[PDB]
Paper text:
The cellular retinoic acid-binding proteins CRABPI and CRABPII act as gatekeepers and facilitators for the passage of all-trans-retinoic acid (and related derivatives) through the cytoplasm to access retinoic acid receptors (RARs) in the nucleus. In this article, crystal structures are presented of the L29C mutant of [name] CRABPI in complex with naturally occurring fatty acids (1.64 Å resolution) and with the synthetic retinoid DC645 (2.41 Å resolution), and of CRABPII in complex with the ligands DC479 (1.80 Å resolution) and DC645 (1.71 Å resolution). The retinoic acid-binding ability of both CRABPI and CRABPII is centred on a hydrophobic pocket created by an orthogonal β-sheet fold and capped with a pair of antiparallel α-helices formed from residues 15–35 partway into the sequence. The pocket contains, at its most buried end, a trio of residues (Arg112, Arg132 and Tyr134 in CRABPI; Arg112, Arg133 and Tyr135 in CRABPII) that are responsible for binding to the carboxylic acid moiety of ATRA, usually in concert with a water molecule that is conserved in all structures with similarly binding ligands.
Wild-type CRABPII expressed recombinantly in E. coli proved to be reliable for crystallization in a repeatable manner and accepted ligands for co-crystallization using an equimolar combining step prior to setting up crystallization drops. Seeking to identify ligands with unconventional binding-site interactions with CRABPII, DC479 was chosen from a number of small-molecule retinoids designed to substantially improve upon the intrinsic fluorescence of the retinoid family and particularly for use in high-throughput binding assays. Of particular interest was the extended carbon chain to which the carboxylic acid group was appended, improving the flexibility around the head group, to determine how ligand flexibility would affect optimum binding into the triad site. The compound binds to CRABPII with an affinity in the 50 nM range, similar to those of other ‘strongly binding’ synthetic derivatives, and thus was an ideal choice to explore ligand-conformation space in terms of interactions with the protein. Additionally, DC479 has been shown to cause the activation of nongenomic pathways whilst having no effect on genomic signalling; a result indicated by a lack of neurite outgrowth in tests with in vitro models. Indeed, its interactions with CRABPII may indicate why this is the case if the effect is caused by carrier-protein interactions rather than RAR binding (or a lack thereof) in the nucleus. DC479 occupies the binding site fully, with its carboxylic acid head buried adjacent to the canonical binding triad and conserved water molecule. Correct incorporation of the ligand suggests that it is not interaction with CRABPII that prevents genomic signalling in the case of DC479, which is discussed further below.
Author numbering: 1 to 137
Write the structure that this text describes.
């Protein structure tokens, strides 16, 4: 079974720490943390073609990409960035991000499928590592 699914979060570490290092102020961090507690995550995968929708009441992100072909999205803190996703295996994709404008910490994300049917999202901003684990429902 591939990345396709409706994914439900079961673990999170260091989400607020991630927003902190990206310069998001306390009140905005509190809104984002509240929204991130209960996201709806939709992934449709066809080979290298991906649709990923992460939706909360206050902020929804939808990206369409092909692994290996560059695209524009936002960083986790809403900064426009150039993205490129590569395979590290059939079960792990790694995305390197470059800001369009301004200055800021180096950002990246990884999505990995475990043999036990979990999805692990890793988001980094310089030193800081945020891990979110999802299961299908
Ligand atoms: C003030 C509100 C509208 N605001 C602006 C600042 C920013 C971009 C940091 C943010 C981020 C989020 C947010 C929520 C969930 C996720 C991730 C969820 C997931 O992948 O499970 C990412 C960002 C929500 C809300 C939010």
């Amino acid at each position: 079974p591939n990345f396709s699914g409706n994914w439900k979060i079961i673990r999170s570490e260091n989400f607020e720490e991630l927003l902190k290092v990206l310069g998001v102020n306390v009140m905005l961090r509190k809104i984002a943390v509240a929204a991130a507690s209960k996201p709806a995550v939709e992934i449709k995968q066809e080979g290298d073609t991906f649709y990923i929708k992460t939706s909360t009441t206050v902020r929804t992100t939808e990206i369409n990409f092909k692994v290996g072909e560059e695209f524009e999205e936002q960083t986790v803190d809403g900064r426009p960035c150039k993205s490129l996703v590569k395979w590290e295996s059939e079960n792990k994709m790694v995305c390197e991000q470059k800001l369009l404008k301004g200055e800021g910490p180096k950002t990246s994300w990884t999505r990995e499928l475990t043999n036990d049917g979990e999805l692990i999202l890793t988001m980094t901003a310089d030193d800081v590592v945020c891990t979110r684990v999802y299961v299908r429902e």
